[PDB]
Design an enzyme around this catalytic site. Structure first.
Site, PDB file in Angstrom:
ATOM      1  N   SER A   1      51.189   2.996  52.789  1.00  0.00           N
ATOM      2  CA  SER A   1      51.371   3.875  51.650  1.00  0.00           C
ATOM      3  C   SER A   1      52.724   3.559  51.026  1.00  0.00           C
ATOM      4  O   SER A   1      53.680   3.249  51.740  1.00  0.00           O
ATOM      5  CB  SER A   1      51.294   5.335  52.105  1.00  0.00           C
ATOM      6  OG  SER A   1      51.512   6.237  51.041  1.00  0.00           O
ATOM      7  N   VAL A   2      52.797   3.586  49.695  1.00  0.00           N
ATOM      8  CA  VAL A   2      54.028   3.270  48.975  1.00  0.00           C
ATOM      9  C   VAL A   2      54.392   4.452  48.092  1.00  0.00           C
ATOM     10  O   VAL A   2      53.532   5.008  47.400  1.00  0.00           O
ATOM     11  CB  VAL A   2      53.903   1.984  48.132  1.00  0.00           C
ATOM     12  CG1 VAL A   2      55.208   1.704  47.395  1.00  0.00           C
ATOM     13  CG2 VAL A   2      53.535   0.785  49.000  1.00  0.00           C
TER      14      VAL A   2
ATOM     15  N   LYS B   1      57.746   1.988  51.556  1.00  0.00           N
ATOM     16  CA  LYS B   1      56.427   1.735  52.130  1.00  0.00           C
ATOM     17  C   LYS B   1      56.390   2.250  53.565  1.00  0.00           C
ATOM     18  O   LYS B   1      57.206   1.834  54.394  1.00  0.00           O
ATOM     19  CB  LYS B   1      56.113   0.241  52.091  1.00  0.00           C
ATOM     20  CG  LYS B   1      54.737  -0.171  52.633  1.00  0.00           C
ATOM     21  CD  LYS B   1      54.560  -1.662  52.388  1.00  0.00           C
ATOM     22  CE  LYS B   1      53.396  -2.259  53.148  1.00  0.00           C
ATOM     23  NZ  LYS B   1      53.454  -3.762  53.062  1.00  0.00           N
TER      24      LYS B   1
ATOM     25  N   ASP C   1      54.522  -9.661  48.959  1.00  0.00           N
ATOM     26  CA  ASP C   1      53.260  -9.539  49.695  1.00  0.00           C
ATOM     27  C   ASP C   1      52.765 -10.902  50.149  1.00  0.00           C
ATOM     28  O   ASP C   1      51.692 -11.368  49.762  1.00  0.00           O
ATOM     29  CB  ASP C   1      52.177  -8.844  48.864  1.00  0.00           C
ATOM     30  CG  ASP C   1      52.334  -7.347  48.837  1.00  0.00           C
ATOM     31  OD1 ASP C   1      53.368  -6.853  49.333  1.00  0.00           O
ATOM     32  OD2 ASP C   1      51.424  -6.664  48.317  1.00  0.00           O
TER      33      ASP C   1
END
Ligand SMILES: Nc1ccc2c(NCCc3ccccc3)nc(-c3ccc(N4CCOCC4)cc3)nc2c1
Length: 328
Positions: free
Chosen positions: A32-33, A48, A159
């Site tokens: 979750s961010v 995050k 990422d």
């Protein structure tokens, strides 16, 4: 020196973070961010919260891998780690990991661009890739949504490691691919920025190869000479022999220097594909290239990748990396 934490629930998820970070705003969901305001630095950050970081050996090793990579990256065009924290006071209670990074404005997937814009965006990707690659790291999953851009057009890769951007040798399952799998991806991205259209929007893995081969042509004798797999060689010799297309015909109206760089990135034979360092020197980037400001990375110890450890051992190594973190 331990800061004071404060708690709150966001989307059926409790967040326990140092008071330093304020006004946590969810930005969506591995982790979750939340967008937040770093009161220490006055900057906007992304926080995050890893999901189930130590659920299994595979998750625990992945958590460690992500932290080690982020702690290593120190380059203007690569996402770096601003902070990492856990509310836990000891290894015994260590269960949650939060990673703090710069909040970027948007990604390339949301951002047809002008040639001057494409020049500067691809330049920055390649400068980041030169650095990542110089550490013997391969991104492996470069695509528009892994490229963050702010309103100033400043770009950061994030990422680290969709099929639309993957190198053909990965599609065909080669075990010994090199760093230029990422250069193939850059070529797909740059093409899309110039035309407004996905270059190879395959519907599956077979359709994906057929679309790639329609552009770059079926492998030549020199490439077959280097293929070990017995099926792979027959498969290559078996399907309809497409001729390499003239890229100038496909990317009609594009800057001829962009077409030439695309020709050098979208080469089927990865032995012949341009490297990041070489591409930075291409005339396409004449107004941005600065050989004195395209630095390489410190060496990165990836030896842990070959290790088979217990879940608790990966968690303990991750804990050590949290404690030893030194902010910029
Ligand atoms: N020196 C090089 C240079 C390039 C190479 C390349 N490029 C992929 C070429 C390609 C051709 C047609 C369609 C897609 C990709 N591909 C392979 C390769 C691809 C697949 C396998 N397999 C997968 C099946 O199980 C056996 C091992 C082994 C090797 N080697 C390369 C060696």
């Amino acid at each position: 020196e331990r800061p004071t934490f404060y708690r709150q629930e966001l989307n059926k998820t409790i967040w326990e973070v140092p008071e330093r970070y304020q006004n946590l705003s969810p930005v969506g969901s591995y982790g979750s961010v939340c967008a937040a305001f770093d009161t220490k630095t006055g900057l906007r950050v992304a926080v995050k919260k890893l999901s189930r970081p130590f659920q299994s050996i595979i998750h625990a090793k992945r958590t460690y891998r992500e932290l080690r990579l982020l702690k290593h990256m120190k380059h203007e065009n690569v996402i770096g780690l601003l902070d990492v924290f856990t509310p836990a006071r000891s290894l015994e209670e260590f269960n949650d990991v939060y990673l703090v990074t710069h909040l970027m404005g948007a990604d390339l997937n949301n951002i047809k661009l002008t040639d001057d814009h494409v020049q500067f965006l691809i330049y920055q990707i390649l400068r980041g890739l030169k650095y990542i690659h110089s550490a013997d790291i391969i991104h492996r999953d470069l695509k528009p949504s892994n490229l963050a851009v702010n309103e100033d057009c400043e770009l950061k890769i994030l990422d680290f490691g969709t099929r639309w951007y993957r190198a053909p040798e990965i599609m065909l399952n080669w075990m010994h691919y090199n760093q230029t799998v990422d250069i193939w991806s850059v070529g797909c991205i740059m093409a899309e920025l110039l035309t407004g259209r996905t270059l190879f929007p395959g519907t599956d893995h077979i359709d994906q190869l057929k679309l790639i081969l329609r552009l770059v042509g079926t492998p030549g004798a020199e490439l077959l000479k280097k293929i070990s797999s017995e099926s792979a060689r027959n498969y290559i010799q078996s399907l309809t022999q497409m001729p390499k297309m003239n890229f100038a015909n496909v990317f009609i109206g594009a800057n001829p220097l962009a077409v030439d760089l695309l020709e050098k990135m979208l080469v089927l034979d990865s032995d012949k594909r341009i490297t990041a360092a070489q591409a930075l020197a291409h005339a396409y980037f004449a107004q941005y290239h600065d050989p004195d400001d395209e630095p390489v990375a410190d060496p990165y110890d990836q030896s842990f990748e070959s290790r088979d450890l217990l879940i608790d051992e990966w968690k303990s190594l991750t804990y050590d990396e949290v404690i030893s973190f030194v902010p910029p």
